[PDB]
Design a binder for these strands. Structure first.
Lengths: 82, 67
DNA sequence: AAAACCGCGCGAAAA
DNA sequence: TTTTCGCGCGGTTTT
């Protein structure tokens, strides 16, 4: 639904599927998907967008430290799970 | 200095702490101290993303299993 | 009820 | 100025 745990999975899928990408491409697409959820209310998009945005930094950063992805001066690249 | 206090660094430590403690079991209480004791909250930052990926799992309160 | 968890988002440090 | 993102106050979930 939400929470770091649910967004880290979104993040990790996105990056592998794109091979190479950026913070903004990742975040904008997660925001857009959450926002087009059938059970979502328009009044709540600005919050949410902000919140998903802060969440993505936390995910990228541990994922980074696990050597699962790249992130080198705005360029984020996939690597692999273990 | 704001880099010394990065989730990412904490992460690296948590990992080493993790891979050292054999069995595959880690006590969230140990790491807490061992990890700068910067504040509990942060530990959950690490566990939530490792759980979302499926590299770990809650085994029992204050405790988690690798892979 | 107590102990564990962990949403959130402000505001200051790095680009 | 904008991009990152430390920090910790409460609210939720488990025990």
């Amino acid at each position: 639904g939400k929470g770091l745990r649910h967004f880290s999975m979104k993040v990790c899928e996105k990056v592998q599927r794109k091979g190479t990408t950026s913070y903004n491409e990742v975040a904008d697409e997660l925001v857009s998907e959450f926002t087009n959820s059938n059970n979502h209310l328009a009044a709540d998009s600005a919050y949410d967008q902000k919140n998903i945005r802060r969440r993505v930094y936390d995910a990228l950063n541990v994922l980074m430290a696990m050597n699962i992805i790249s992130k080198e001066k705005k360029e984020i690249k996939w690597i692999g799970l273990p | 200095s704001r880099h010394e206090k990065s989730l990412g660094l904490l992460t690296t430590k948590f990992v080493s702490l993790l891979q050292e403690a054999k069995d595959g079991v880690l006590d969230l209480k140990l790491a807490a101290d061992t990890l700068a004791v910067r504040q509990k909250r942060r530990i959950y930052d690490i566990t939530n993303v490792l759980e979302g990926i499926g590299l770990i799992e809650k085994k029992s309160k204050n405790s988690i299993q690798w892979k």
